[PDB]
Structure formats: structure tokens, C-alpha cells
Write a protein that binds this ligand. Structure first.
Ligand SMILES: *[B]([O])([O])[C]([C]N1[C]=C(C([O])=O)N=N1)[N]C(=O)[C]SC1=NN=C([N])S1
Length: 355
């Protein structure tokens, strides 16, 4: 179809120069419009092995993994396994009647506990250390009033969701969430038969690097996936009514905005904006003030759009979809590039595609 060549030209125009500007080994860019998928692959999945990026290449999603954690939370909530008004001590019994047991699950998933930073303390490694950290936790800012983007906040949320489903979190995604979304090669732990498809990341000095195990790493940033699976995930977010009710209600749960900070609406995992959104509005969601510092939230849009950036030391990820236009884009790179470049390139592509 002529649309195949129209999308290929737009992605070559906006995303391909990023490979030479930032010395990116490999990249996969996908566009889904009107239920049609368009996949563009560039460069090498592995420099040592000289493998081209293809439809089987597995990328580290980074913070985009939080979208699957939120989907799992919306799945357990609509099945009656959890209520977003419950507290973690109801499911993690060792946290019963502790200060952290005063924060509800929605506040953990939306980073409003009032005293949780971007990362765990460096010395928090083992599972006993993670439990000790939450048992010793004490509140600072008023609970539910300040948003500070936090891995441990949503990591505890995913830990609680796994406990309510009576299965480990890796099985929550790989056995229930991933099959319900129709995903074929998305993993929390990549099996040995898929290591040949697991791309290597590359740091600023072009050395190979792969994400390391960390405290609650799976619900925070430890999901790996391919471009076709991520396009299927965007399709599920673009057309939730075409999926069974259990996963349909889970997707709808992640689309409801819970509060707003300036022009950004914080949904479950996703970042929500009023459509049409200016480029600066999407860029402001990446600013140091929003990402690294606490911000007072404001209580609560008809036309909406959503996006989420994700990164590891050697990978960059960006997903975005517009329900009114029935269009979405996925960017996967095996070298971390500035988030503004990911947003700008996807903004120019989605706006130049014919309706
Ligand atoms: B998420 O992407 O927002 C989140 C925060 N983050 C970290 C970085 C980075 O260090 O490049 N960019 N955004 N991502 C993470 O916490 C995972 S970072 C890690 N990379 N390798 C590891 N062993 S941990």
C-alpha cells in the first residue's frame, strides 16, 4: 500500500538521523494507525554478534515497564483482588499497622506517598532489606498531596498486586497479563532460548551493557519486549473494547487521570494530556522539575492523549497513542537518547501522517 511507503519516509525523516547524531547501534520504530501496523528497523541488535534489528529483537523497556505494572493493578482491581483504597499491609502482612500502611495503593501507584525518592537507597539490595526499608518508613510530606516520581513507590504497588493474585510478579505478567494482551515475546526474565534475540544496550562510550537485578526491579523497569508486541500493546490501549472484559477493564483503569500537575494528568502509569497537546506540553512532562522534584497535585478532559518515556543505562523507549485519531507510535533504541528527541521525533511523525 502507498501508506506503507508514506510511513517509512516519515520515520526515516525524523527517527533515522537520530542514529547518526547519537551513535545509536540499533533502533525499532513502529506506527499503528486504523488497526494497521508499520514496523521500521535500523542498525544492529548486537555489535559483537553483527545481528540486525528485526521483528524478534528484544529491547529493555525501562520505565515503560510501569505501564504493565499499572495494567496488572487495574486487572486485579476489577477482579476484586484489590481496591485502590486498600493499604499495602492488607496484603503484605509484615507492613500491617506501620506508617507505610497509611498510604493507599493508588497513592503508591501515582507517586504521592510524600516520602519516596526516585530510587531505593543504594544499600537496599536484598528482600529482607526491602522489607526493613518499608517497615522503617515514616511520612514526610502530607500523604496524597505531592507527586515525586519514584521507583520504590510503584514497585511496592506491583509487589502488593502480585500478593493479591497469589503469584510472583514475574508470573503475574508472563502468565496472566502478557497472554491477555496477546503478546508473544515480552518477558520479565528472558529465557535461554530467547537470549539470541535479546539486544545489548550500549552506554555513552559504546560499551555493551545489560540491565542488572535490583530491588523490585521487575515492576519498576525490568520488562523486555519486541516491537510487534509493543504495537499490540498500543493497539490494546487504542481499542480496549475489542478485548475480553477482564483485560478491557484493566486497560480502561490505566487511562483514568487521578490528578494533575500543571498541564500533565497522572493516570495509572500513563501520563495523560488534553489533545491536541502542544509540543512544549509533552516536553514539560520530561522537565527536571516534574521528574526529579516533588510537586503539589491538583484535583481534576474529553479529548486526551497519553505517552510514557522509559530508559535504562543502555536503552531508550517511548510510547504514545492518540485515541481520537486511532494512532500510536513506539520507539525502541539500544542506546539511551535524550527524552526530548524521542518526543519531538514522534510528535513530527504523528502530526504529518494523513488522517
Ligand atoms: B525510568 O526510566 O524513568 C527510570 C528512571 N530513569 C533512569 C535512567 C538512567 O539511569 O538512564 N533514566 N530514567 N528508569 C530506571 O530506574 C532504570 S535505570 C537502570 N539501568 N541499568 C540498571 N542496572 S538500573
Amino acid at each position: 500500500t502507498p501508506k506503507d511507503q508514506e510511513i517509512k519516509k516519515l520515520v526515516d525523516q525524523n527517527f533515522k538521523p537520530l542514529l547518526e547524531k547519537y551513535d545509536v547501534p540499533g533502533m525499532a520504530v513502529g506506527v499503528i494507525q486504523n488497526n494497521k501496523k508499520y514496523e521500521m528497523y535500523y542498525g544492529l541488535q548486537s555489535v559483537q554478534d553483527k545481528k540486525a534489528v528485526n521483528s524478534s529483537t528484544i529491547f529493555e523497556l525501562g520505565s515503560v515497564s510501569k505501564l504493565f505494572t499499572a495494567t496488572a493493578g487495574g486487572y486485579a482491581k476489577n477482579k476484586g483482588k484489590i481496591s485502590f483504597d486498600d493499604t499495602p499491609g492488607k496484603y503484605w502482612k509484615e507492613l500491617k499497622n506501620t506508617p507505610i500502611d497509611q498510604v493507599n495503593l493508588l497513592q503508591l501507584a501515582t507517586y504521592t506517598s510524600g516520602n519516596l525518592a526516585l530510587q531505593f537507597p543504594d544499600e537496599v539490595k536484598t528482600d529482607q532489606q526491602v522489607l526493613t526499608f518499608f517497615k522503617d518508613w515514616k511520612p514526610k510530606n502530607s500523604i496524597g498531596e505531592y507527586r515525586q516520581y519514584s521507583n520504590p513507590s510503584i514497585g511496592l504497588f506491583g509487589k502488593v498486586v502480585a500478593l493479591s493474585m497469589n503469584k510472583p510478579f514475574d508470573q503475574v505478567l508472563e502468565k496472566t497479563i502478557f497472554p491477555a494482551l496477546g503478546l508473544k515475546h515480552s518477558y520479565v526474565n528472558v529465557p535461554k532460548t530467547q537470549m539470541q534475540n535479546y539486544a545489548f544496550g550500549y552506554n555513552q562510550e559504546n560499551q555493551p551493557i545489560r540491565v542488572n537485578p535490583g530491588p523490585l526491579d521487575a515492576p519498576e523497569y525490568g520488562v523486555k519486549s519486541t516491537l510487534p508486541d509493543m504495537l499490540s500493546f498500543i493497539h490494546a490501549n487504542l481499542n480496549p473494547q475489542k478485548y475480553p472484559a477482564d483485560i478491557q477493564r484493566a486497560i480502561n483503569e490505566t487511562h483514568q487521570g487521578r490528578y494533575q500537575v500543571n498541564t500533565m494528568y497522572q493516570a495509572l502509569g500513563w501520563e495523560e494530556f488534553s489533545y491536541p497537546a502542544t509540543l512544549q506540553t509533552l516536553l514539560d512532562s520530561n522537565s527536571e522539575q516534574i521528574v526529579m522534584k516533588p510537586n503539589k497535585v491538583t484535583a481534576i478532559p474529553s479529548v486526551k492523549m497519553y505517552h510514557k518515556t522509559g530508559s535504562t543505562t543502555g536503552f531508550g523507549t517511548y510510547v504514545v497513542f492518540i485515541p481520537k485519531e486511532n494512532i500510536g507510535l513506539v520507539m525502541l533504541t539500544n542506546k539511551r537518547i535524550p527524552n526530548e528527541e524521542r518526543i519531538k521525533a514522534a510528535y513530527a511523525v504523528l502530526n504529518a501522517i494523513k488522517k
